Design a protein around this ligand. Structure first.
Ligand code: BCL
Ligand code: BCL
Ligand code: BCL
Ligand code: BCL
Ligand SMILES: CC[C@H]1c2cc3[nH]c4c(c3C)C(=O)[C@H](C(=O)OC)c4c3nc(cc4[nH]c(cc(n2)[C@@H]1C)c(C(C)=O)c4C)[C@@H](C)[C@@H]3CCC(=O)OC/C=C(\C)CCC[C@H](C)CCC[C@H](C)CCCC(C)C
Ligand SMILES: CC[C@H]1c2cc3[nH]c4c(c3C)C(=O)[C@H](C(=O)OC)c4c3nc(cc4[nH]c(cc(n2)[C@@H]1C)c(C(C)=O)c4C)[C@@H](C)[C@@H]3CCC(=O)OC/C=C(\C)CCC[C@H](C)CCC[C@H](C)CCCC(C)C
Ligand SMILES: COC1=C(OC)C(=O)C(C/C=C(\C)CC/C=C(\C)CC/C=C(\C)CC/C=C(\C)CC/C=C(\C)CC/C=C(\C)CC/C=C(\C)CC/C=C(\C)CC/C=C(\C)CCC=C(C)C)=C(C)C1=O
Ligand SMILES: COC(C)(C)C/C=C/C(C)=C/C=C/C(C)=C/C=C/C(C)=C/C=C\C=C(C)\C=C\C=C(/C)CC/C=C(\C)CCC=C(C)C
Ligand SMILES: COC1=C(OC)C(=O)C(C/C=C(/C)CCC=C(C)C)=C(C)C1=O
Ligand SMILES: CCCCCCCCCCCC[N+](C)(C)[O-]
Ligand SMILES: CCCCCCCCCCCC[N+](C)(C)[O-]
Ligand SMILES: CCCCCCCCCCCC[N+](C)(C)[O-]
Ligand SMILES: CCCCCCCCCCCC[N+](C)(C)[O-]
Ligand SMILES: CCCCCCCCCCCC[N+](C)(C)[O-]
Ligand SMILES: CCCCCCCCCCCC[N+](C)(C)[O-]
Ligand SMILES: CCCCCCCCCCCC[N+](C)(C)[O-]
Ligand SMILES: [Fe+3]
Lengths: 281, 240, 302
């Protein structure tokens, strides 16, 4: 059940709630108060999904979908079968995600490490909450949230996107996509870099960090360093998700026409708005 | 059709790859053990991979993994319950015994070396010609513990030469000797350095180094563990 | 809160790090550039040296040539007017030959030939830059992992601009050089192919793109959380596991019931990332060549 070095770390303490009541493990898994909360919310949520599947009349995972209340309900409670289940499942999911993060904090405390992981995960939760809570509340209806279904969630992405034309033209979406693409690039490189040093040409000695710096400086004239790359990946991926949330919190609220037309303010600036030639004259 | 062949092949490739990735990640800490040190009955469905061998530079030998796994140190903990899966209470002082969040690993009792075989980390006063180049210079500042008391004064910065970065503050105690504090566990303010992890009376406790101008992997682990462990074990005297 | 390790509190500097020699021809290395106090709050202050070399030069020159061919055409589309140039910057586009020219190089300058010339300079800039990722690792006796990962990105690129057009039978299938126009191409490609959301490789590609943000978030955060135990010194932790690597692994084991090692995480990383363009390239390559309509394909399950 334990890794060969694990026992020295398995001491009492670090919990946030309940002293030592839940201060124990199950196999590899730490429990704690929030381990217990997580189980409760997740199990309720799954049971409610299964019920929803029975009412929907199917057990196929490709088919089961849980839709929010229709727009006519606004921000009220819908009858269980007409969107209410979606509403309780959404409370459960948030319960589970937040509980998961708080459990991670308890683990950090036990291990004497920094809180970076749960804090990073908090960005993912916030993006989720943007789509299902913040944006719908701002727009006046639960029905604007995405449905819980493997394929139907993708219908929502398409319909929402095309409601504003080609979603590519959301400027905040462009920044977001850029952080995503740059992240994947940096992950490839950090991975490759470390492995190329740890696993040199056949028969050579392991290279050093100096060789990593050297390699990169040689290639592009800069190296961010080893602290920097881990700061970088954290920043890039957290920023991707920040601008993802931003790009949606603004859609259907402060801007609701075709995103392509937002770009017109630049073209219609007095000093060149009227000059002929080019594409727009 | 070809697309179907391609997607179906890709899923097989992906299972293999997850298998490869999971086995690669079992080159340390395995085989699993019971709470007493002995191989566990249940090892999981993934086998250990064939060993691989790292040639270490500067004649320091090799590392072969997986291989015989040993703590190489006493562990001052005892069971608190009759069944599997509960915490193990420290039998002594967990700061001194190096357990819990005060834990250290028994790494090589030599210093990390740079690409040229020189010591990776030196005190700045012996690194030609390193200097503080931005931010508040901590050298000279009084060092405050989380009991809000002074425990010493910063007498130098230990620097990572090849990465030109600050790693430790060297801190002089009331008795003339020094201790390394990890850079990541101090707050440099304008009129002091603050250490949240430690109360002032725990500073004498920081593991000392054996040669005053170098530090070994082993000693670094002992220093960092001790200081981190303070967050849990010094909390009765805090006040943050 | 206490110190977080996002920005350094104190910067230190010493002699310029000229770097490891190994088999590197030092004749071809610059000297340092300036030190950026700004950059050094976050990463390294030192700029340079870089490594020149013939391929370096060829790649760099060919790269500029590409950029300049697109730019000349932009100016020309602006009717040489600077104020129109800035105004319609994102609207300019250098387009490939029309279908009727098939794969021939006949196409007139203003009507496809300039796109081909730019594509030529791009083809040589990129491949020669690839040779560069290989040779620079070689000269230092390192594994070829970077050149190996770069090949995945190259694959998608190649498929978009070169392999697919050739297979489709015409350069008009390729991607225009322009900010807004490359987006429009992207949106039309999907529309014309029955919506890429039904392309199983588009789905996987998304999983790995999102996966990379998840993983780099996880890894980046984990290393900074254990940087107080020297965690970021990843190679020495590989060679001689410390309390950093152990607390790292145990965090994840306690959280989700399994964990990585200091070396193995970097293998999850490299593969999460390269799988993005790997699956992506396959998804695109099959589009129009073997599958016309992904929705249709998906109805027959294949
Ligand atoms: C993947 C499917 C589509 C496509 C889908 C999209 C979508 C959707 C978006 C982009 C966006 C980007 N795309 Mg595109 N992209 C395509 C493939 C390409 C290719 C290529 C095949 O070589 C290139 C160079 C670009 C590059 C561009 C950038 C302008 C922009 C940021 C990318 C990035 O962060 O990269 C990694 C980061 C780097 C470190 C290097 C890149 C830096 C930039 C500045 C260089 C690219 C071009 C450069 C010459 C810009 C000149 C600016 C002015 C004209 C002077 N795309 C293919 C055909 N791309 C986003 C955007 O904001 O567009 C406006 C966006 O929303
Ligand atoms: C036709 C569709 C439109 C369009 C539709 C829109 C719409 C609509 C949206 C996006 C959004 C996204 N689009 Mg878009 N967009 C299009 C095409 C593009 C293209 C492209 C190359 O063509 C790209 C790269 C992107 C990229 C982007 C991203 C910036 C963003 C999604 C990431 C995200 O929000 O993560 C955020 C992270 C999460 C939401 C996941 C969090 C989950 C956590 C908290 C918990 C789950 C755990 C649990 C269930 C696990 C089970 C337990 C098991 C044991 C594992 N779009 C086209 C033009 N786009 C979305 C966005 O920005 O939303 C904020 C969005 O709503
Ligand atoms: C983020 C912006 C958009 C988004 C747009 C897209 C698009 C576009 C695509 C997906 C696709 C995925 N999305 Mg989505 N979708 C979003 C909302 C989310 C949320 C959420 C907020 O809770 C979840 C759980 C999912 C998860 C799903 C997966 C089924 C699939 C692979 C994702 C992945 O590898 O992630 C990266 C993370 C990992 C690699 C970790 C793995 C965790 C996965 C496997 C968890 C799956 C849980 C799922 C089966 C729900 C069951 C929960 C149980 C009842 C416990 N999406 C919002 C609406 N999503 C792809 C697909 O093919 O779908 C058919 C796809 O093309
Ligand atoms: C309306 C739009 C369509 C759709 C259109 C398509 C199309 C078309 C494509 C994608 C592709 C992808 N889509 Mg999609 N996309 C849809 C909606 C989504 C959504 C969503 C709805 O939320 C998401 C998250 C995604 C996102 C994704 C990505 C996973 C994937 C691109 C991978 C990549 O890293 O490329 C970025 C990386 C590269 C392009 C490689 C870079 C190559 C190198 C060699 C170039 C170097 C340039 C250098 C010379 C420039 C120098 C400048 C420097 C500064 C020096 N799509 C909808 C349904 N999508 C791509 C794919 O693979 O599909 C299978 C693709 O072709
Ligand atoms: C902020 C940058 C990125 C990020 C970071 C991040 N994610 C993280 C972490 C961090 C640091 C955590 O530490 C945590 C983790 O433990 O990782 C293994 C996690 C995590 N990210 C996960 C998934 C995930 N993250 C996402 C992505 C991202 N996470 C961003 C890109 C996505 C995407 C891109 O779609 C997914 C799918 C999980 C593996 C894990 C959180 C696991 C967890 O919270 O478990 C507790 C709850 C359950 C076990 C299940 C609860 C079930 C619900 C009650 C019902 C389900 C309802 C749901 C809304 C249905 C959705 C239907 C879909 C078809 C749409
Ligand atoms: C999943 C894999 C991800 C990935 C992989 C990847 N990309 C990589 C690498 C790998 C591992 C390589 O090692 C290679 C690299 O060297 O990176 C540092 C690369 C690379 N990917 C790059 C771009 C890139 N990758 C992207 C995609 C991805 N890369 C995926 C997300 C994208 C996107 C998302 O569209 C972009 C645009 C480059 C940074 C580099 C390839 C460099 C190259 O082929 O250059 C050829 C052309 C030139 C040398 C000159 C170009 C013309 C410039 C305008 C001149 C700049 C120089 C000038 C003298 C400076 C003047 C400055 C002024 C402009 C102010
Ligand atoms: C250097 O450092 C590093 C390591 O360390 C040395 C690491 O390992 C890791 C960790 C990273 C990996 C192991 C790489 C692989 C990870 C991914 C590809 C990311 C995707 C993750 C998954 C697909 C796993 C999802 C599984 C989850 C979230 C848990 C599922 C388990 C359950 C059944 C949950 C039910 C409820 C529980 C367990 C609460 C507990 C309470 C009771 C049981 C009661 C990182 C980041 C790292 O940087
Ligand atoms: C200020 O003005 C000056 C002139 C000084 C400079 C400014 C210039 C400007 C403004 C340039 C701006 C350029 C822009 C906006 C470029 C945008 C590029 C984008 C977004 C392209 C994205 C897609 C690119 C792809 C997919 C390219 C693939 C290319 C290939 C695979 C090459 C295929 C090879 C061919 C067809 C040639 C065949 C030859 C052989 C080898 C036989
Ligand atoms: C393998 O890790 C990597 C580094 O190598 C050690 C880098 O350094 C960078 C490049 C980062 C930055 C901030 C460039 C900015 C520099 C200038 C000239 C303004 C990336 C992406 C990376 O992946
Ligand atoms: C609300 C979304 C639909 C519920 C999905 C059903 C849970 C089973 C696990 C999902 C994975 C699909 N799978 C592997 C069974 O095909
Ligand atoms: C390569 C590291 C530098 C980050 C570049 C990421 C590309 C997107 C840049 C947009 C920056 C927008 N921002 C954050 C300044 O508002
Ligand atoms: C992504 C690279 C650019 C990062 C530059 C950010 C500069 C921030 C400066 C904060 C300095 C912190 N402080 C006050 C302790 O010195
Ligand atoms: C992608 C990062 C690009 C970094 C550029 C390479 C820097 C080389 C600087 C050498 C020139 C010295 N300088 C600027 C003082 O003249
Ligand atoms: C490094 C490997 C990480 C493993 C991630 C695999 C997640 C599978 C995502 C499902 C994609 C579904 N579909 C139908 C579009 O193919
Ligand atoms: C794609 C997500 C599927 C969920 C399964 C994830 C694997 C984690 C399994 C942990 C192993 C449990 N253990 C150690 C008790 O056997
Ligand atoms: C796509 C990610 C898949 C994650 C699941 C792979 C490993 C799950 C659990 C591994 C076994 C842990 N164990 C029992 C060896 O300790
Ligand atoms: Fe790393």
């Amino acid at each position: 059940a334990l890794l060969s070095f694990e026992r020295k770390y398995r001491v009492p303490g670090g919990t946030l709630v309940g002293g030592n009541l839940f201060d124990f493990w199950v196999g590899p898994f730490y429990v704690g108060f929030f381990g217990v909360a997580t189980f409760f919310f997740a199990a309720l949520g799954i049971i409610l999904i299964a019920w929803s599947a029975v009412l929907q009349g199917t057990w196929n995972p490709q088919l089961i979908s849980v839709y929010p209340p229709a727009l006519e309900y606004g921000l009220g409670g819908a009858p269980l079968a007409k969107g209410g289940l979606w509403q309780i499942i959404t409370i459960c999911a948030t319960g589970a995600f937040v509980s998961w993060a708080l459990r991670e904090v308890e683990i950090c405390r036990k291990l004497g490490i920094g809180y970076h992981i749960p804090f990073a995960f908090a960005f993912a939760i916030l993006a989720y909450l943007t789509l299902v809570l913040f944006r719908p509340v701002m727009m006046g209806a639960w029905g604007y949230a995405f449905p819980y279904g493997i394929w139907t969630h993708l219908d929502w992405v398409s319909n929402t996107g095309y409601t504003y034309g080609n979603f590519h033209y959301n400027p905040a979406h462009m920044i977001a996509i850029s952080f995503f693409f740059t992240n994947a690039l940096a992950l490839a490189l950090h991975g490759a870099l470390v492995l190329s040093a740890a696993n040199p040409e056949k028969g050579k000695e392991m290279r050093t960090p100096d060789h990593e710096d050297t390699f990169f400086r040689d290639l592009v004239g800069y190296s961010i360093g080893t602290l920097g790359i881990h700061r970088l990946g954290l920043l890039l991926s957290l920023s991707a998700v920040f601008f993802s949330a931003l790009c949606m919190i603004i859609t259907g609220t402060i801007w609701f026409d075709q995103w392509v037309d937002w770009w017109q303010w630049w073209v219609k600036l007095p000093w060149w708005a009227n000059i002929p030639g080019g594409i727009n004259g | 059709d070809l697309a179907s062949l391609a997607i179906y092949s890709f899923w097989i490739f992906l299972a293999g790859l997850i298998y490869y990735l999971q086995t690669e990640n079992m080159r340390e800490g395995y085989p699993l053990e019971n709470e007493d040190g002995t191989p566990a009955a249940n090892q999981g469905p993934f086998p250990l991979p064939k060993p691989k061998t790292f040639i270490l530079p500067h004649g320091r030998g090799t590392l072969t993994v997986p291989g015989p796994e040993s703590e190489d140190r006493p562990i001052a903990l005892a069971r608190t319950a009759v069944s599997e899966g509960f915490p193990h209470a420290p039998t002594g002082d967990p700061m001194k015994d190096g357990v819990g969040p005060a834990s250290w690993v028994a790494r090589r009792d030599l210093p990390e070396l740079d690409g040229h075989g020189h010591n990776k980390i030196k005190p700045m006063k012996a690194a030609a010609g390193f200097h503080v180049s931005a931010g508040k210079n901590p050298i000279g500042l009084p060092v405050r513990g989380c009991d809000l008391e002074i425990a010493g004064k910063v007498v130098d910065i230990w620097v990572d030469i090849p990465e030109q970065m600050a790693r430790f503050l060297e801190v002089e105690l009331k008795d003339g000797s020094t201790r390394l504090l990890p850079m990541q566990m101090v707050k440099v303010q304008s009129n002091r350095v603050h250490v949240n992890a430690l109360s002032s009376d725990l500073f004498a406790g920081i593991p000392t180094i054996k040669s005053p101008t170098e530090v070994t992997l082993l000693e670094e682990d002992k220093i960092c563990g001790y200081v981190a462990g303070g967050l849990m074990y010094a909390a009765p005297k805090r006040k943050s | 809160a206490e110190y977080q390790n996002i920005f350094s509190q104190v910067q230190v500097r010493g002699p310029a790090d000229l770097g490891m020699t190994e088999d590197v021809n030092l004749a071809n290395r610059s000297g340092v550039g300036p030190f950026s106090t700004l950059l050094g709050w976050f990463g390294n202050a030192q700029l340079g040296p870089i490594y020149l070399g013939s391929l370096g030069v060829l790649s760099l020159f060919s790269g500029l040539m590409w950029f300049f061919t697109i730019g000349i055409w932009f100016w020309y589309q602006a009717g040489w007017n600077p104020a129109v140039f800035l105004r319609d910057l994102f609207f300019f586009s250098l387009e490939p030959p029309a279908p009727e020219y098939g794969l021939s190089f006949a196409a007139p300058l203003k009507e496809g030939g300039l796109w081909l010339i730019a594509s030529f300079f791009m083809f040589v800039a990129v491949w020669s830059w690839w040779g560069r990722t290989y040779l620079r690792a070689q000269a230092l006796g390192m594994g070829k992992h970077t050149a190996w990962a770069f090949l995945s990105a190259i694959w998608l690129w190649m498929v978009l601009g070169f392999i697919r057009p050739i297979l489709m039978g015409s350069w008009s299938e390729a991607v225009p050089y322009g900010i807004f126009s490359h987006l429009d191409w992207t949106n039309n490609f999907s529309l014309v192919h029955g919506n890429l959301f039904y392309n199983p490789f588009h789905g996987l590609s998304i999983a790995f793109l999102y996966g990379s943000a998840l993983l780099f978030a996880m890894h980046g955060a984990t290393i900074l959380a254990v940087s107080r135990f020297g965690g970021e010194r990843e190679l020495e932790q590989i060679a001689d596991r410390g309390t950093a690597a152990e607390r790292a692994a145990l965090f994840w084991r306690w959280t989700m019931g399994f964990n990585a090692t200091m070396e193995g995480i970097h293998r999850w990383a490299i593969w999460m990332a390269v799988l993005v363009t790997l699956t992506g390239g396959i998804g695109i390559l099959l589009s129009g060549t073997v599958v016309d309509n992904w929705y249709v394909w998906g109805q027959n399950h294949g």
